[PDB]
Amino acid sequence: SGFRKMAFPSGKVEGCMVQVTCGTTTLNGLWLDDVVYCPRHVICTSEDMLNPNYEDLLIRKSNHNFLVQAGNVQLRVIGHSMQNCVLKLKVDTANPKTPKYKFVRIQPGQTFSVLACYNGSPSGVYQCAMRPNFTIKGSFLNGSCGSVGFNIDYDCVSFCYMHHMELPTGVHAGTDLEGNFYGPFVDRQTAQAAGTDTTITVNVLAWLYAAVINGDRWFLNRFTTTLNDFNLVAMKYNYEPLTQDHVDILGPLSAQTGIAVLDMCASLKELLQNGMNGRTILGSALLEDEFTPFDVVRQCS
Amino acid sequence: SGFRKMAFPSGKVEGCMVQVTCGTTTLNGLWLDDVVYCPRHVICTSEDMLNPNYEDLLIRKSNHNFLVQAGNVQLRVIGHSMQNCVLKLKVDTANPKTPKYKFVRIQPGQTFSVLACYNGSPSGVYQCAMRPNFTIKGSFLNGSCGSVGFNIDYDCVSFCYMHHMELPTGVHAGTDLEGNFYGPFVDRQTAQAAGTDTTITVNVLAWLYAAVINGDRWFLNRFTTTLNDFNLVAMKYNYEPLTQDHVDILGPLSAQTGIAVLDMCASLKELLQNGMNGRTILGSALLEDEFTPFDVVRQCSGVTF
Ligand SMILES: *C(=O)[C@H](C[C@@H]1CCNC1=O)NC(=O)[C@H](CC1CCCCC1)NC(=O)c1cc2ccccc2[nH]1
Ligand SMILES: *C(=O)[C@H](C[C@@H]1CCNC1=O)NC(=O)[C@H](CC1CCCCC1)NC(=O)c1cc2ccccc2[nH]1
């Protein structure tokens, strides 16, 4: 029993982190086979922050302008190319610690683990979710760029995020491992603002199911709702719409607990109206939205 | 910026986990040098949960009664002995992935990372605190016994916890790696209950400092207090007493933020007596007590291992 925000074990990713330096900029790179992936803004200088022409900047670089270090060993860059907003540095040696892996682009509401790194070495590991507005609420300082987010279902590592920047409101933006940003952001230091953050409704419902599984029932009620009436209410609290896909996805948890999905929606509606009245759910006094239905099933069984 | 409940990177520990099976029971072991450590209750049968004399049951057991598997390779057990509530199985080969390590016993209020494992395979990692009542509020299912808790300092892994059991209230109990239980618990099938828990005051204060460092400042005020005055309020609200050592340890954070400890104590006193009035701190609607002062320092300065 118990319920914790649980990350994946980080060892398979730790063995892939390296340090990449270009000019005076140092950040992290991901070394898989004979390629090191890192944010392309490592090639920017202090005058190229607003409107960098990355194709023009990259063509001027030599292989030896990139210093790549794995532990106390320099890797020799033998080639470079850019794919969207990531740089791919070809090196002369394959990483012997490369795990089984794939690159996956995730949808808002999906969760993943982040291995926060500085100078190629790990600082710590934590869980994150892709917010509906395509930001993540991370913990990242200067030098963290190039840290990755990942899931490890099975023994396969699915890389889904690479860190690039912090928006003025304190949240974070980045790309997939093909170099495409999540959301409308660009790798320029120009004024950019994320959409209004909303709550990930299907994840709140998953977490209420987790609470029942762990023995807690105080928030249940005798009512039900239609899906359309639920959405009319939840949007007034800046909750994301719940779709029929979401209802289908909660079928398994509904079957395990004997609580129909639309009956749990009626519980959530009352919680939004009443608050918690000095109570907690799974040790929280707010409704958590960073556990997916899949996460709940992994942890509770 | 930002602030998250952050676990230590687990790679150094993952390479030490193995599976240990005795009779019908399977759980995890920790393989360091040429010894595998696991809970001694692995030896119990259904007719020994009630009241077992493990020292008598261990004589009856022979080396080949312990199946140890590291991945798909079987380790050969060449000896066995007990240390308190931990079984030590000597194996014929040293773990080539053994990290620099030591065994340490932690104090209540200290935090550590748990590598939850099943069948010898690491499954997830999260940060815990040793509660004042000597339990931990973990997430553990059947087959997780022998999962371990650890801290890392530079290149050194300090192992501090091995998991043994779940109490009726759903919190968890275990031992250090020399097999001494944390708290007034025993490894017998019997009625056991956690003591009433209290909140870790020095950790709440550290987290309030983390909040200010991240620009969350609504709870600060003009007032200050004394230790005696504060501690009288603490006792009233089931908070752990705040000592002078605690004030000293927060010293850094006080100087960095310009909020003296007793100044921040006056903030915490008001939060206790008045609550949060519908506001949050670092995304929480409760006062969080599972970050130590050192936890805050290393997250806010980007310390690596
Ligand atoms: C890479 O290591 C950092 C990671 C940042 C530092 C603070 N927290 C983080 O997550 N990335 C940056 O510093 C980028 C660099 C830019 C180079 C040119 C192309 C765009 C990215 N900058 C920022 O994240 C940045 C600058 C800035 C100024 C004012 C407010 C916010 C802000 N964020
Ligand atoms: C080891 O893998 C498990 C871990 C437990 C399973 C559920 N959650 C956990 O953390 N440990 C056990 O199952 C122990 C075994 C005992 C054998 C005899 C010596 C003491 C340990 N049992 C329990 O944890 C247990 C039994 C029990 C009965 C009623 C309420 C709670 C309860 N916990």
Return d(Cα B234, Cα B227) in angstroms, integer. Answer: 10
The three-state DSSP-derived secondary structure of chain B is CCCCCCECCCHHHHCCEEEEEECCEEEEEEEECCEEEEEHHHHCCCCCCCCCCHHHHHHHCCHHHEEEEECCEEECEEEEEEECCEEEEEECCCCCCCCCEEECCCCCCCEEEEEEEECCEEEEEEEEECCCCCCECCCCCCCCCCCEEEEEECCEEEEEEEEEEECCCCCEEEECCCCCECCCCCCCCCCCCCCCCCECHHHHHHHHHHHHHCCCCCCCCCCCCCHHHHHHHHHHCCECCCCHHHHHHCHHHHHHHCCCHHHHHHHHHHHHHHCCCCCCECCECCCCCCCCHHHHHHHHHCCCC
User: Which of A158, A167, A97 is CA-nearest to residue A131?
Assistant: A167
Please give the Cα distance from A151 to A159 (Å, whole number). Answer: 7
For residue B17, list chain A residues with Cβ-Cβ distance below 8 A: none
Q: Round to whole Å and give the CA distance between A181 and A227.
A: 33
DSSP designation for A43? G
Q: Does B280 touch chain A (CB under 8 A)?
A: yes
Handedness of CA B248, B251, B253, B254 (dihedral sign): positive
Looking at beta carbons, which residues of chain A come within 8 Å of B140? 1-2
Residue numbers of A between 36 and 95 with CB closer than 8 Å to B: none
Q: What is the CATH number of domain A15-99?
A: 2.40.10.10
d(CA A173, CA A188): 12
B48, B165, B189, best to mutate for ligand 2 pocket (most atoms within 8 Å of CB): B165
CA dist., res. B119 & res. B127, Å (int): 21
All residues of chain A having their beta carbon less than 8 Å from the beta carbon of residue B283 are 137, 286
| B85 included as an active-site residue | no
Give residue for tokens 């909020």: B259
Q: Is the minimum distance from the CB of A143 to ligand 1 under 6 angstroms?
A: yes
How far apart are alpha carbons B285 and A277 in whole angstroms?
A: 12
Half-sphere exposure for A201 (CA within 13 Å, toward CB):
29
Distance, in Å, from the CA atom of B128 to the CA atom of B137, rounded to the nearest integer, reads: 7
Of B113, B74, B114, nearest to B92 (Cα)? B74
Give Cα separations from A286 to A64, B18, B207 (angstroms): 52, 38, 18
Residue of A nearest to B215 (CA): A170
Ranges of CATH 1.10.1840.10 domains, chain B = 198-301
| Residue of minimum CA distance from atom 8 in ligand 1 | A141
Q: Which atom of ligand 1 is nearest to the CA of A144?
A: 2
User: How far does CA A229 lie from the centroid of its chain?
Assistant: 31
Pick the CATH number of B198-301 from 1.10.1840.10, 3.10.180.10, 3.40.190.10, 1.10.599.10: 1.10.1840.10
What is the C-alpha separation between B155 and B158, in angstroms, rounded? Answer: 10
Nearest to A123 among B2, B3, B302 (CB): B302
Phi, psi of B202 (to 5 degrees): -60, -30
- Contact between chains at A286 and B298 (C-beta distance less than 8 A): no
- How many Å apart are CA A239 and CA A233, to the nearest integer? 9
* B27 in contact with ligand 2, CB cutoff 6 A: yes
Helices (H), ranges, chain A: 11-14, 54-59, 201-213, 227-235, 244-249, 251-257, 261-274, 293-300
Kindly identify the ligand whose nearest atom is closest to the C-alpha of B302: 1
**A and B: number of Cβ contacts within 8 A:** 133
**Please, what's the largest Cα pairwise distance for chain A?**
69
Please classify residue B56 by burial: count the beta carbons closer than 10 Å to its beta carbon, then call 0-12 exposed, 13-18 middle and 19+ buried: exposed
A43 lines ligand 1 (CB under 6 A): no
- Give the residue, by CA position, lying nearest to ligand 2 atom 11: B165
DSSP β-bridge partners for residue A101: A157
CATH code at B1-14+100-197: 2.40.10.10
Integer CA distances (angstroms), A141 to A28, A72, A156, in order: 12, 23, 28
Other Cβ atoms closer than 10 A to B86: 23
Closest residue to B125, CB basis, from A10, A140, A143: A10
User: Which pair of structure tokens corresponds to residue B133?
Assistant: 């009542």
Residues of chain A with CATH 2.40.10.10: 1-14+100-197, 15-99
Which residues of A, range 141-160, sit inside 8 Å of B by Cβ? 141, 143-144
DSSP string for residues in A128-194:
EE--TTS-B-----TT-TT-EEEE-STT-EEEEEEEEEE-TTS-EEEE-TTSPBSTT--SSSS---P
What are the structure tokens assigned to B217, written together? Answer: 């400042």
Find, in chain A, the residue whose alpha carbon is nearest to that of B277. A278
Task: Give the number of other Cβ atoms within 10 Å of residue A236's Cβ.
Answer: 9
Check B6 against A144: CB less than 8 A apart.
no
Quick check: is B41 catalytic?
Answer: yes
**B2, B15, B116: residue with CB nearest A138:** B2
The whole-angstrom separation of Cα B21 and Cα B89 is 12
* Whole-angstrom distance, CA of residue B103 vs CA of residue B158: 6
Angle at B106 between CA B104 and CA B109, to 5 degrees: 160
d(CA A288, CA A210): 11
Cβ contact A178:A168 at 8 Å: no
Angle between helices B201-213 and B261-274 (to 10 degrees): 100
- The reply to whether ligand 1 has any atom less than 6 angstroms from the CB of A183 is no
Half-sphere exposure of B52 (CA within 13 A, CB side): 21
> What is the C-alpha R_g of chain A?
22
**Which experimental approach was used here?**
X-ray
A128 interaction partners in chain B (CB closer than 8 Å): 4
Among the listed residues B213, B197, B196, the one whose alpha carbon sits nearest the alpha carbon of residue B205: B213
